[PDB]
Design a protein around this nucleic acid. Structure first.
Ligand SMILES: [Mg+2]
Ligand SMILES: [Mg+2]
Ligand SMILES: [Mg+2]
Ligand SMILES: [Mg+2]
Ligand SMILES: [Mg+2]
Ligand SMILES: [Mg+2]
Ligand SMILES: [Mg+2]
Ligand SMILES: [Mg+2]
Ligand SMILES: [Mg+2]
Ligand SMILES: [Mg+2]
Ligand SMILES: [Mg+2]
Ligand SMILES: [Mg+2]
Ligand SMILES: [Mg+2]
Ligand SMILES: [Mg+2]
Ligand SMILES: [Mg+2]
Ligand SMILES: [Mg+2]
Ligand SMILES: [Mg+2]
Ligand SMILES: [Mg+2]
Ligand SMILES: [Mg+2]
Ligand SMILES: [Mg+2]
Ligand SMILES: [Mg+2]
Ligand SMILES: [Mg+2]
Ligand SMILES: [Mg+2]
Ligand SMILES: [Mg+2]
Ligand SMILES: [Mg+2]
Ligand SMILES: [Mg+2]
Ligand SMILES: [Mg+2]
Ligand SMILES: [Mg+2]
Ligand SMILES: [Mg+2]
Ligand SMILES: [Mg+2]
Ligand SMILES: [Mg+2]
Ligand SMILES: [Mg+2]
Ligand SMILES: [Mg+2]
Ligand SMILES: [Mg+2]
Ligand SMILES: [Mg+2]
Ligand SMILES: [Mg+2]
Ligand SMILES: [Mg+2]
Ligand SMILES: [Mg+2]
Ligand SMILES: [Mg+2]
Ligand SMILES: [Mg+2]
Ligand SMILES: [Mg+2]
Ligand SMILES: [Mg+2]
Ligand SMILES: [Mg+2]
Ligand SMILES: [Mg+2]
Ligand SMILES: [Mg+2]
Ligand SMILES: [Mg+2]
Ligand SMILES: [Mg+2]
Ligand SMILES: [Mg+2]
Ligand SMILES: [Mg+2]
Ligand SMILES: [Mg+2]
Ligand SMILES: [Mg+2]
Ligand SMILES: [Mg+2]
Ligand SMILES: [Mg+2]
Ligand SMILES: [Mg+2]
Ligand SMILES: [Mg+2]
Ligand SMILES: [Mg+2]
Ligand SMILES: [Mg+2]
Ligand SMILES: [Mg+2]
Ligand SMILES: [Mg+2]
Ligand SMILES: [Mg+2]
Ligand SMILES: [Mg+2]
Ligand SMILES: [Mg+2]
Ligand SMILES: [Mg+2]
Ligand SMILES: [Mg+2]
Ligand SMILES: [Mg+2]
Ligand SMILES: [Mg+2]
Ligand SMILES: [Mg+2]
Ligand SMILES: [Mg+2]
Ligand SMILES: [Mg+2]
Ligand SMILES: [Mg+2]
Ligand SMILES: [Mg+2]
Lengths: 275, 100, 68, 88, 114
RNA sequence: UGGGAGAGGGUGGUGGAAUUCCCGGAGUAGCGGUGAAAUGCGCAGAUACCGGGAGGAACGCCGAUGGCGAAGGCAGCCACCUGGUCCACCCGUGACGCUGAGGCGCGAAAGCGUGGGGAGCAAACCGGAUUAGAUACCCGGGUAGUCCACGCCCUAAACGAUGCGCGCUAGGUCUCUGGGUCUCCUGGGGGCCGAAGCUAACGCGUUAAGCGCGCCGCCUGGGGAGUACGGCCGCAAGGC
């Protein structure tokens, strides 16, 4: 339930902020944070390779347990749910009966004080992780490994989920957040339920500065530039595109497909996405 | 506490001891949700009126039980988890209604 | 010919009584009218509710084909 | 629902004498008991407007009785409403 | 080839289509108001269905087909003629059974059927 | 106190039929559609048949002249939560009642906002016909929308065109649902036909539109006009 503001400034008219009402702990576990080297979208040559990045708030990275098969069989208690500035989801702090403390992505409806567990035998229960082959068909799942033991790769953004649709030998058929239908190996891990903080998409940044807080520097339209800069540059007065709408680098950007055709994962993509 | 009849159909093409593991799960689920078994009518394999899971038959369980009303929905759901549980219909126990 | 007459005492809430109940279906699986059933207003509602359960349990059909 | 056990406690705890089943006091407590379990039911099911009509009838019903007991005995009135915590 | 199979009569108000299959339901041959050079409304008439079945049975018989279980769907005008056509062709019609689809109140009909 | 009938409401589940799409099989010269056609679809393998899968919506028979609700309205099935209502006993309170300007809540469809969903259907729209024309009816397509959640809108042939409460004034017949002593007697509903009486007539008639009392709403020739101005409400449409 996003929070709104009275129009006491021009920007507060529209600004919405997350309600943060699920967060129980407001500074991070000191043994599970590390420095996040800001990049400004510059590579190791020093060149901007992703335009319009930088200048955002300082952040500590929280180390997230994307494996969970690390600790098959060891129940953990949900100790706290916390803010994480490096992702859209919230994160949950597990106190394993081992003594080990780890973070995971906070699925929807997970509660402080409940217990979660990973493994083939885990109860079909929000927060438990299992290999996909043991999750019954139809179950809504998240934090999905894309290849066995390579780490949860799919459905990790706030609100997303993947639905199990069928099985076929060693493989399961998933419907991804995009709506694509894909084979994923049965031994791949996933966590029961959807990612939480589903209201994330309804936030209205409200003012330019709020984008700047996130590290997003202003985006300049190609039509605002000059011919040396961009296909859409130049012209007297305003100007329509005057050619198929293009990127700065000249490739077409309205419909031109860019997935590599001869890609091996094609044998596993059943249906391309939707909408 | 209220009395209910819990009807269950299972995968008919199992062996007898796999069938027993399923019933053991049923039994624990019943026990964990506060159920009080009174009867047990296990007619087992019965050919159906139509295919269920491409199967013309299924293994029929039945339990006259007593449990706290606020839990039968979760129980009936927890029973539905196992894939071999192809049908579960909990029903309020009713006094008979008779003709002739 | 009426079903209620051609049947002794029976419980029309027992939904597992396929032998009694399957006599209340047409050749094509439809719940018989009262003009065939011989049941009253109160009895027919109870019969239908229990036939409907048994169809879900797989004990009765939703629909059969017509053979000539 | 409301079991006969809980129902007899309100009759017991408000009967003007052992045997009284329809005095103004036990009528209001019986109504307050329905009203509050329903007030809590409609806090969860806000879309259940049909039951809310019944809530309003019980509310009006209790109000008319309390208007009668406050006309006869403003001391029986005050004493009853404080044992049920009413009057906002 | 196969000794015996089935026979499906799809018949609406616009046409009558007959398809012969095998035991397993896979088709062997088919005909309809079009295969006997009728175009338009004429395709829905009972004579159209008669020729359609006779052509469908004849093609089947010339494949060793001897026996047929008759399966009828639709309410077209050529329905009951097509059944007569199958027996009269030389095929040994074992049974006849209606299987016309009927929704237990499913999808909203086109405006024309309300 | 003890009983009952019910598509009354809300929430969470879940079953089959059917349509569409997709994959596999088999198969070939049309299918579809109409008054007749054409557009459309189809040898790039359609239609018809079989196996498989996905997804949405709506619940056949039961089913009715039926039931429930204050109205709008409510129909697979299961459970939870919740309302109303009737009947038996005649046990408790002792007129605690009726109506109700304002107020407050509910309020079909369509429409609106934000997400979601989208099979079928289908405003707009495109095409094919018909025609003098055809911004239509008929046909092939098709976007909102129809569906879900929350928040709005507050209208209607929102009708029984019949405000609510109470008492009184022949009966006959059918039905739903209770109770009994089970012919029947008796309650509470739902229809038909009719006593007396009412009505301009049609018709109404113990479900009054009869005979009476209470209270409320409303009318005062047609058009202008449910328009304008003003006020209040609404995001808007527009409502009062
Ligand atoms: Mg704001
Ligand atoms: Mg303001
Ligand atoms: Mg939060
Ligand atoms: Mg350190
Ligand atoms: Mg770096
Ligand atoms: Mg470097
Ligand atoms: Mg350098
Ligand atoms: Mg260098
Ligand atoms: Mg870039
Ligand atoms: Mg940059
Ligand atoms: Mg976060
Ligand atoms: Mg991110
Ligand atoms: Mg894989
Ligand atoms: Mg935004
Ligand atoms: Mg930042
Ligand atoms: Mg940006
Ligand atoms: Mg810009
Ligand atoms: Mg420029
Ligand atoms: Mg310039
Ligand atoms: Mg330069
Ligand atoms: Mg250049
Ligand atoms: Mg140059
Ligand atoms: Mg440059
Ligand atoms: Mg250039
Ligand atoms: Mg240019
Ligand atoms: Mg210049
Ligand atoms: Mg320019
Ligand atoms: Mg210019
Ligand atoms: Mg310029
Ligand atoms: Mg140009
Ligand atoms: Mg270009
Ligand atoms: Mg490229
Ligand atoms: Mg894709
Ligand atoms: Mg299951
Ligand atoms: Mg029973
Ligand atoms: Mg035709
Ligand atoms: Mg009672
Ligand atoms: Mg094909
Ligand atoms: Mg063509
Ligand atoms: Mg070819
Ligand atoms: Mg879909
Ligand atoms: Mg008395
Ligand atoms: Mg006295
Ligand atoms: Mg409305
Ligand atoms: Mg609507
Ligand atoms: Mg909308
Ligand atoms: Mg659509
Ligand atoms: Mg045209
Ligand atoms: Mg036209
Ligand atoms: Mg002309
Ligand atoms: Mg012309
Ligand atoms: Mg059309
Ligand atoms: Mg259409
Ligand atoms: Mg479409
Ligand atoms: Mg009407
Ligand atoms: Mg009026
Ligand atoms: Mg009034
Ligand atoms: Mg009524
Ligand atoms: Mg009557
Ligand atoms: Mg007279
Ligand atoms: Mg008069
Ligand atoms: Mg007359
Ligand atoms: Mg008359
Ligand atoms: Mg009359
Ligand atoms: Mg009468
Ligand atoms: Mg006026
Ligand atoms: Mg006037
Ligand atoms: Mg108006
Ligand atoms: Mg106006
Ligand atoms: Mg005005
Ligand atoms: Mg008005």
């Amino acid at each position: 339930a996003v929070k709104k503001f009275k129009p006491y400034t021009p920007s507060r008219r529209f600004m919405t902020v997350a309600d943060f009402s699920e967060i129980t702990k407001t500074e991070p576990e000191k043994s599970l944070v590390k420095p996040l080297k800001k990049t400004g979208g510059r590579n190791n040559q020093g060149r901007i390779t992703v335009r319009f990045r930088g200048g955002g708030h300082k952040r500590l990275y929280r180390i997230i347990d994307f494996k969970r098969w690390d600790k098959v069989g060891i129940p953990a208690k949900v100790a706290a749910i916390e803010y994480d500035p490096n992702r859209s989801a919230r994160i949950a702090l597990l106190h394993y009966v081992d003594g080990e403390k780890r973070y995971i992505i906070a699925p929807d409806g997970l509660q402080v004080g409940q217990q979660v567990v990973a493994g083939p035998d885990a109860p079909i229960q929000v927060g438990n992780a299992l290999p996909l082959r043991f999750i019954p068909v139809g179950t809504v799942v998240h934090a999905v490994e894309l290849e066995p033991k390579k780490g949860a790769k799919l459905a990790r953004a706030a609100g997303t989920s993947a639905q199990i649709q069928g099985r076929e030998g060693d493989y399961v058929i998933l419907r991804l957040p995009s709506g694509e239908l894909r084979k994923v190996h049965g031994e791949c891990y996933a966590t029961v339920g959807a990612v939480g903080n589903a209201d994330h998409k309804n936030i209205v940044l409200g003012k330019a500065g709020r984008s700047r807080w996130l590290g997003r520097r202003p985006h300049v339209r190609g039509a605002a530039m000059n011919p040396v800069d961009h296909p859409h540059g130049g012209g007297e007065g305003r100007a329509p595109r005057g050619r198929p709408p293009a990127s700065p680098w000249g490739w077409q950007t309205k419909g031109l497909k860019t997935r590599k055709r001869r890609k091996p994962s094609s044998r596993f993509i059943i249906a391309r996405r939707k909408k | 506490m209220r009395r209910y009849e819990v009807n269950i159909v299972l995968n008919p093409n199992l062996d007898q001891s796999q069938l027993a593991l399923e019933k053991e799960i049923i039994q624990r689920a019943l026990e964990n949700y506060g159920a009080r078994v009174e009867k047990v009518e296990e007619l087992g394999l019965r050919r159906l009126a139509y295919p269920i899971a491409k199967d013309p038959q299924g293994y029929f369980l039945w339990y006259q039980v007593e449990m706290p009303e606020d839990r039968v929905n979760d129980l009936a759901r927890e029973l539905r988890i196992r894939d071999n549980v192809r049908r579960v219909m909990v029903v309020k126990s009713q006094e008979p209604f008779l003709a002739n | 010919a009426k079903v209620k007459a051609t049947l002794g005492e029976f419980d029309l809430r027992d939904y597992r009584n396929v032998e009694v109940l399957k006599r209340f279906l047409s050749e094509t699986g439809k719940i018989l009218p009262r003009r065939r059933t011989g049941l009253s207003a109160k009895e027919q509602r109870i019969l239908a509710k229990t036939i409907k359960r048994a169809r879900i349990l797989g004990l009765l059909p939703f629909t059969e084909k017509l053979v000539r | 629902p409301i079991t006969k056990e809980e129902k007899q406690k309100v009759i017991q705890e408000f009967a003007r004498f052992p045997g009284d089943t329809g005095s103004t006091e036990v009528q209001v407590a019986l109504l307050t008991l329905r009203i509050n379990r329903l007030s809590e039911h409609l806090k969860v099911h806000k879309k259940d407007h049909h039951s809310h009509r019944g809530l309003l009838m019980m509310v009006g019903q209790r109000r008319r009785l309390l208007r009668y007991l406050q006309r006869e005995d403003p001391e029986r009135y005050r004493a009853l409403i404080e044992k049920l915590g009413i009057r906002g | 080839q196969v000794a015996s199979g089935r026979a499906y009569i799809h018949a609406s108000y616009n046409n009558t289509i007959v398809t012969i299959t095998d035991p397993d339901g896979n088709p062997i041959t088919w005909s309809s108001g079009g295969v006997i050079g009728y175009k338009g409304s004429r395709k829905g008439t009972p004579y159209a269905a008669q020729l359609a079945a006779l052509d469908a049975a004849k093609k089947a018989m010339a494949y060793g087909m001897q026996s047929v279980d008759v399966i009828v769907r639709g309410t077209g005008a050529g329905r009951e003629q097509a059944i007569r056509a199958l027996q009269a062709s030389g095929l040994q019609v074992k049974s006849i059974v209606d299987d016309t689809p009927v929704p237990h109140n499913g999808c909203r009909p086109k405006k024309k059927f309300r």
